[PDB]
Design a protein around this ligand. Structure first.
Ligand SMILES: *[C@@H]1O[C@H](CO)[C@@H](O[C@@H]2O[C@H](CO)[C@@H](O)[C@H](O)[C@H]2NC(C)=O)[C@H](O)[C@H]1NC(C)=O
Ligand SMILES: *[C@@H]1O[C@H](CO)[C@@H](O[C@@H]2O[C@H](CO)[C@@H](O)[C@H](O)[C@H]2NC(C)=O)[C@H](O)[C@H]1NC(C)=O
Ligand SMILES: *[C@H]1O[C@H](CO)[C@@H](O[C@@H]2O[C@H](CO)[C@@H](O)[C@H](O)[C@H]2NC(C)=O)[C@H](O)[C@H]1NC(C)=O
Ligand SMILES: *[C@H]1O[C@H](CO)[C@@H](O[C@H]2O[C@H](CO)[C@@H](O)[C@H](O)[C@H]2NC(C)=O)[C@H](O)[C@H]1NC(C)=O
Ligand SMILES: *[C@@H]1O[C@H](CO)[C@@H](O)[C@H](O)[C@H]1NC(C)=O
Ligand SMILES: *[C@@H]1O[C@H](CO)[C@@H](O)[C@H](O)[C@H]1NC(C)=O
Ligand SMILES: *[C@@H]1O[C@H](CO)[C@@H](O)[C@H](O)[C@H]1NC(C)=O
Ligand SMILES: *[C@@H]1O[C@H](CO)[C@@H](O)[C@H](O)[C@H]1NC(C)=O
Ligand SMILES: *[C@@H]1O[C@H](CO)[C@@H](O)[C@H](O)[C@H]1NC(C)=O
Ligand SMILES: *[C@@H]1O[C@H](CO)[C@@H](O)[C@H](O)[C@H]1NC(C)=O
Ligand SMILES: *[C@@H]1O[C@H](CO)[C@@H](O)[C@H](O)[C@H]1NC(C)=O
Ligand SMILES: *[C@H]1O[C@H](CO)[C@@H](O)[C@H](O)[C@H]1NC(C)=O
Ligand SMILES: NCC1(c2ccccc2)CCCC1
Ligand SMILES: NCC1(c2ccccc2)CCCC1
Lengths: 728, 728
């Protein structure tokens, strides 16, 4: 009799899922923004005090989207006037507020359009990037000092990444790294002089008479890449009438051979920095640990402190090589790498020795190292119940790898199987974050007694609202393909009657090291399709997917568009044989890589799918960026992998689309998967005489995330889907 | 029992409509390309001879799309390697073939990428434009002489028009004019230095890794326009070691005041040239007749030889002021202008007097003056039967305006009501071209006996094919609106049963001075919709339409988007009341201006239309070019017509689209109605929460005319239409 989860409920977020975001500022204290008030909580006693009243934000231009308190707690930074750029980058305005004299620094302010800013790890120094140059302010009220002079739009980047490093290498816009005690400021410089430009029209507000052309240095497969340099600036000598004292650290010879990338920076101590470089091929990476020479100011490296990591069956790491986690002394480190069996586990390395020792093993994988003390190492893995789509926090004794405890496994076995964690300094306390399968749950714990100090947020409000509505259920299970067991999930309609025949909707991603099958709780479009439209929405992780060993992940090496596409078809074929699926009404959709896979499926002529929707899909790999594409496909030259580049385009399967109903969608301002991709795909379908539907979204980028576009696209795909399934 | 005219029949042109293209080369001879053979016909005796065997084209690179024989018949020009640009412009390669020594000129050839080329009116001189500069060749085998040095891509144009002059002023790419006896070569120079650039992406062949950006100097409403200069070059002194002798003719002071355009050039005699200029406003034009001064080389003008033409209720002429037609002596001319009642008729002017005398009158209009001898004047009008959508050839005695004969009216009253004509030199013979309502019919006639020498093409083959198929019928009639009678047409399905109720498709254009209702025979998409899908396709010419007097045409002056849109709604409303139309299923579609109107109707909230399709529509007048837009709307400034510019956008009616099914289509490479227009329109619909369909066509220009795109768009609109009409 109750209501169903509606499209409007989804599009409007009428069912709010709460969370708990905190920032640790010591080994037992943390800040929390509550009702626009910044409160200081003491993990020990649970008591809190007001750190900054809600009545201070009231007048800072307008909305204050973010804050950052200096480590010495003397100042606070206010971020506002946010202007988004790519996936991670953006520019903003900042105000510095003196917490002592409780005033607002007015002289020597931070520039407008600041690209990045950060306090030093200690004290209250500031470093920021503006107009592609780096500046340092020793005091909030004193004049900043310019560190670089080469900054230049679309050419030289100091302190921040260019387009490709942001998206594929750093997964961040930032390229600045203060040393632990603020002595040194390390940064990377990117040169895009020889990178070709992708250009597209941005129409802007209706009042703009002429469209403007956006230009981005974007390297497509096999094109010229940006070069990079790494510098360590000694901030001690920074003065208005002094030059900048900096040293340039170059990569090891084994990398200087040809094109390469800087993929990681980690400070070990005030005089020891760790750099991780990888060759353009991405099957050879190396860690170079450089020591500061106090009598020359040089950062020296030695072959003894270099650690090589290669891959013979594919690429190194998941999306990039894993980061090293050093001990306080810096004489050793722990890092995730592939073991003998192809599973990723933690290996213990000695800084000046090449041999490492695995401290974990099994047919499961370590997702990442979370914290490290002199006695324990905390990490996250999907070992529990052997569920690759589950996550838990584990702790292992460093003096006896035999003693490993699961800190999250049994807290709420039914409600919580997917966690992430955030540790305080020195790992004395930690917040545990549960994302499903039940309602998210945030908790605070002590590392000494493993006791649960308290419940930070349990979403009891959401629970209330949902018991009044007919929610669908999510079931996870397994099936066999090629003698290998793979996972899949199904969002089943309320009051699921294994008798009736329901229409199926396959939602796919399926890109290298992907995971669409997990135990995370999500109020999604699928929630609505199952709840209101009685459609079954399933997902499957086959060959190429991650967190199940290099064996399954590297299956699609140098051959994207083959096995992962084929496995979606065979898995759907097995789903359609289970009596509760109307094989006459099967569809599939995806975004990005899921859009590519969706298209490849539809064009396979399997006769299995009736219709499909592709949103901002890749259509030809030579159109995508160099870092991501080459990592799996090599170079598109007749000497390397051109043949597999050519027969993996969606265009080459155009004729087969005559057998299905296809919906192609794309944002005209997509800086990531260029509109070109869909423009070229549609032209191939037109030339083949194939009828299909289209939908462009003016000025929307890769996310197609503006409030109105977001609502419009899901509304549109719903009509298309219901038309195809003959649903009223 | 027979077949119906199918979509495939239309898309593939299975039913060929033949024509007869000839080129007059004297007062009694003409050339005709037959089976790749150039034959020379003698109108007098009807006998023909081979002028150039089909066996000469065989090897000229490849296909020879066109030929041009010099007037002295000594040479012939072969055009090939055609590369289209805008609506009229294109570049090509040319070979000169010596008809005497029957050889092929090999030395001093014509450049590749030639923009325009033409023989002189006599002899065998040649003038051509290459890289925006003019060149003259006195002999096919001799070196050409460069005439201009200012040529520059997207900036200076010598001898050819820029984008806006090509599309809106000259309706041609050409800007060169030889004098009657080849002495002088006149040309216009266009400067686009200050014209803003419209830019858009061209994706090209799938193999192009990066899309290229096309840039065109295009002036939008109120923007900076291109300036122009007119020169008369004396070719007699052209020599390799001599400078160029030329004179610059400037416009009359009444035009130099502000911005203006050169809209017409006409040579009167070897020493008298006629220039027609118009102000940017386009409600004031003037004809300046300049005489050559043999002792100074100057081209002099006098106030006595100037003729002003203004409009107080709108703009001058139809799309541009009509051209003057001078007598051999050049002492007088005949030109179409609006009379006292607002109807366009022929006025007789004296070159040095300001008063003219109308030689025709009535509630009908003269379409154009076709030929002029010392005894008669031939013209075309829609006077017959008072049908504004009919055309006929008339002849009027110059010494007695009372004697006027209709030469085409009664030849085939049932089969032919729409003619055009082509006269030989001195008007001794003429070809008559009938375009409907029956099958096209070409005939050759003598001016002396008005006798029909012979039938050039009667399409008897097409007649044969069509009697085997169920063709629809076209009926023309009238209806009253605001006390004024307007015309409309309906393509009725075969075996039309005035009983049953059929869905109605309204095909609209309705732009200023347009005519959708005529008696021309057309194998169109509508032919298929009526014949096979049993849909009625109607068209209506209301306020704003042409050929019915300035009264009706100037109705929409300074207010586009109002009356012509409203009249389509009221006329459809009256059509729906006629018992044979299903009021529940009515649609409307259009192209360009028809797309605008179509969209303005769908957004009127009249409740009359269920669905509609708009192809490459204008959505906001400030986005269209200056010449066309300003002609009807004035300037978009608060001092002029900004208010009507703002409330006539399609966007302002977005909310109303929630009541209809809308299909928006646009070529991404449209240089005319920029993709911007539809991009901005769709964004307004998305912001309003309106659901609608879309369809972009990669790299297609304004015509969307590539073979595959052509077939695809009509196939797509047919599915949309049938979905909306619930037709299987
Ligand atoms: C591209 O072409 C290759 C080579 O023909 C395809 O690889 C074969 O795929 C078939 C599946 O139909 C397998 O039976 C063979 O074992 C494969 N051979 C190799 C060399 O792996 C590949 O599937 C094609 N890729 C795409 C995207 O269609
Ligand atoms: C094309 O038109 C532009 C006007 O914009 C001319 O440029 C001006 O030329 C004069 C004289 O040389 C200079 O004093 C101005 O400074 C120029 N202004 C600009 C906008 O550049 C240009 O010379 C013209 N070219 C031709 C071939 O006529
Ligand atoms: C700043 O802080 C006060 C609390 O100290 C906020 O007041 C609370 O508001 C929530 C709902 O918004 C109530 O449920 C609490 O009970 C309120 N507490 C009090 C003091 O009554 C106040 O809303 C905040 N100011 C702003 C900017 O909204
Ligand atoms: C918007 O501009 C004017 C503003 O009123 C509109 O008004 C005109 O058209 C009406 C038709 O409903 C007439 O009733 C008004 O009298 C007439 N106003 C004037 C001053 O003559 C006009 O129609 C609108 N144009 C568009 C495109 O919507
Ligand atoms: C919490 O209370 C303790 C005493 O039990 C005090 O020492 C501490 O400073 C307080 N922490 C806060 C809320 O800052
Ligand atoms: C950027 O790279 C280009 C191309 O190699 C080079 O010419 C230029 O000097 C470099 N600039 C800097 C600041 O490194
Ligand atoms: C730095 O130099 C400027 C003049 O160039 C001078 O005004 C200022 O006093 C100097 N600062 C220091 C550190 O003395
Ligand atoms: C590393 O990748 C390159 C790129 O093709 C390849 O030639 C080489 O064999 C690879 N090396 C390993 C360790 O597999
Ligand atoms: C037709 O024949 C006549 C002979 O009476 C001749 O004069 C004429 O040139 C011929 N027509 C042509 C040009 O083929
Ligand atoms: C014309 O100029 C050319 C180029 O300098 C020269 O070779 C030629 O002799 C000149 N013609 C004469 C002789 O007048
Ligand atoms: C000519 O047209 C312009 C266009 O705005 C107008 O301002 C001017 O008054 C008009 N004059 C005549 C003769 O109609
Ligand atoms: C060219 O014309 C001749 C005329 O005799 C004709 O017979 C021949 O078929 C034609 N050749 C072609 C197809 O070009
Ligand atoms: N850029 C890497 C990703 C991608 C791949 C193909 C297409 C779009 C986006 C894959 C993982 C995050 C985004
Ligand atoms: N520009 C001239 C035309 C037009 C008008 C509006 C929109 C597109 C095209 C009007 C007549 C021919 C084409």
């Amino acid at each position: 009799s109750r209501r169903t989860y509606t499209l409007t409920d989804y599009l409007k977020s009428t069912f709010r899922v709460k969370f708990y975001t905190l920032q640790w500022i010591s080994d037992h204290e943390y800040l929390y923004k509550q009702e626009n008030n910044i409160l200081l909580f003491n993990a020990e006693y649970g008591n809190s005090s007001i750190f900054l009243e809600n009545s201070t934000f009231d007048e800072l231009g307008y909305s204050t989207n973010d804050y950052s308190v200096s480590p010495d707690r003397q100042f606070i930074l206010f971020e506002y006037n946010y202007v988004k750029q790519w996936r991670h980058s953006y520019t903003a305005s900042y105000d510095i507020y003196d917490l002592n004299k409780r005033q607002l620094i007015t002289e020597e302010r931070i520039p407008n359009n600041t690209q990045w800013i950060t306090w030093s790890p200690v004290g209250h120094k500031l470093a920021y990037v503006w107009n592609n140059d780096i500046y340092v302010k020793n005091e909030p009220n004193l004049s900043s000092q310019r560190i670089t002079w080469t900054g230049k739009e679309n050419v030289i980047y100091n302190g921040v990444t260019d387009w490709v490093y942001e998206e594929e290498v750093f997964s961040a816009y930032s390229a600045l790294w203060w040393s632990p005690n603020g002595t040194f400021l390390a940064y990377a410089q990117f040169n895009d002089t020889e990178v070709p430009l992708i250009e597209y029209s941005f129409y802007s507000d209706e009042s703009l008479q002429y469209p403007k052309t956006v230009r981005i240095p974007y390297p497509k497969a096999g094109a010229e890449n940006p070069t990079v340099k790494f510098f360590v600036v000694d901030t001690r000598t920074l003065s208005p009438n002094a030059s900048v004292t900096s040293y340039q650290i170059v990569p090891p010879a084994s990398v200087l051979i040809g094109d390469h990338y800087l993929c990681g920076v980690t400070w070990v101590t005030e005089e020891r920095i760790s750099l991780q470089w990888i060759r353009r091929a991405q099957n050879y990476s190396i860690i170079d640990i450089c020591d500061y020479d106090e009598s020359t100011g040089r950062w020296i490296s030695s072959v003894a402190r270099q650690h090589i990591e290669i891959s013979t069956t594919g690429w190194v790491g998941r999306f990039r090589p894993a980061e090293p986690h050093f001990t306080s002394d810096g004489n050793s480190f722990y890092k995730i790498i592939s073991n003998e069996e192809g599973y990723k586990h933690i290996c213990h390395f000695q800084t000046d020795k090449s041999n490492c020792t695995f401290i974990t093993k099994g047919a499961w994988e370590v997702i990442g190292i979370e914290a490290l003390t002199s006695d324990y190492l905390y990490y996250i893995s999907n070992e529990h119940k052997g569920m690759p789509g589950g996550r838990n926090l584990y702790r292992i004794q460093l003096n006896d790898y035999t003693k490993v405890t699961c800190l999250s496994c049994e807290l709420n076995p039914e409600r919580c199987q997917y966690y992430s964690a955030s540790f305080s300094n020195k790992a004395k306390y930690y917040q545990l974050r549960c994302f499903g399968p039940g309602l998210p749950l945030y908790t605070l714990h002590s590392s000494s007694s493993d006791k649960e100090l308290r419940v930070l947020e349990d979403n009891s409000a959401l629970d209330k609202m949902l018991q009044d509505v007919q929610m669908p259920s999510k079931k996870l299970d397994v099936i066999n393909l090629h003698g290998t067991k793979f996972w899949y999930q199904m969002i089943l309609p309320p009051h699921f009657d294994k008798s009736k025949k329901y229409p199926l909707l396959i939602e796919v991603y399926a890109g290298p090291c992907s995971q669409k099958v997990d135990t995370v709780f999500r109020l999604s479009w699928a929630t609505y399709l199952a709840s209101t439209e009685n459609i079954i929405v399933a997902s499957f992780d086959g060959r190429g997917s991650g967190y199940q060993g290099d064996k399954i992940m590297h299956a699609i090496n140098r051959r994207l568009g083959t096995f992962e596409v084929e496995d979606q078809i065979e898995a759907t074929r097995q789903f359609s044989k289970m009596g509760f699926v109307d094989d006459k009404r099967i569809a599939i959709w995806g975004w990005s890589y899921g859009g590519y896979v969706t298209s490849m499926v539809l064009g396979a002529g399997s006769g299995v799918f009736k219709c499909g929707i592709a949103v901002a899909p890749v259509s030809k790999w030579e159109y995508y960026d160099s870092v991501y594409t080459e990592r799996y496909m090599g170079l598109p030259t007749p000497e390397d992998n051109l043949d597999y580049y050519r027969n993996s385009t969606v265009m080459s399967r155009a004729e087969n689309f005559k057998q299905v109903e296809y919906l192609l969608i794309h944002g005209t301002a997509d800086d990531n998967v260029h509109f070109q991709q869909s423009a070229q795909l549609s032209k191939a379908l037109v030339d083949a005489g194939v009828d299909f539907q289209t939908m462009w979204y003016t000025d929307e980028d890769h996310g197609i995330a503006s409030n109105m576009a977001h609502q419009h696209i899901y509304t549109h795909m719903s009509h298309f889907l219901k038309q195809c399934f003959s649903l009223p």
